[PDB]
From a paper:
Small Hsps (sHsps) form large oligomeric assemblies with a high capacity for holding onto nonnative proteins that are handed over to the ATP-driven chaperone machines for refolding. sHsps are ubiquitous among the kingdoms of life and within mammalian genomes occur in large families with members differentially expressed in many tissues including muscle, brain and the eye lens. Small Hsp sequences have in common an “α-crystallin domain” (ACD) of around 90 amino acids, with most having a short conserved C-terminal extension bearing an I-X-I motif and a longer variable N-terminal extension. The ACD is an immunoglobulin-like beta sandwich comprising strands β2–β9, and the assembly unit is a dimer. The conserved arginine in human sHsps is on the β6 + 7 strand at the dimer interface, not far from the dyad axis.
Numbering used by the authors:
A (entry chain A): 67 to 151
B (entry chain B): 64 to 150
Amino acid sequence: EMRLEKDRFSVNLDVKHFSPEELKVKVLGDVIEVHGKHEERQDEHGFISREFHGKYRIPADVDPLTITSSMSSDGVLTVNGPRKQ
Amino acid sequence: GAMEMRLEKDRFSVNLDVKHFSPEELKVKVLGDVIEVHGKHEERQDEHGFISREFHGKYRIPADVDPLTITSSMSSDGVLTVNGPRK
């Protein structure tokens, strides 16, 4: 969920079932890259693997070096940077 | 957790969180005495945004559950349940 305000630009993701250990955020050029992987090999009667990949092009008026990520209690991953004005 | 298994006296069930998936994108298969589940969701806007979401799972069916009477359902809360009565 891309969000373009006047003041900032953010990218919000629901990652409720991934711990911070299982998430990675990278920036290369003007592209934000996000990945998550969680596994529950629960015994001999079950398993589940969950995965997501995301790429988001950064607006031209946002310096890619000013980018930061964060995770909240509600289980949301945000990648954001201020817009240069 | 995104998954829980639950044994009652009348039924067996497996609950799953699949909130971000539409019914079209989900697949429930009963393979003998094993349940297999799969979902894949992709949103592309070139050349600006890409999100890809995937899950894969398998569970063993208890001996007193007939694989043939296993049904699945999807709720409005975005929850997938695979359930079968017991014998």
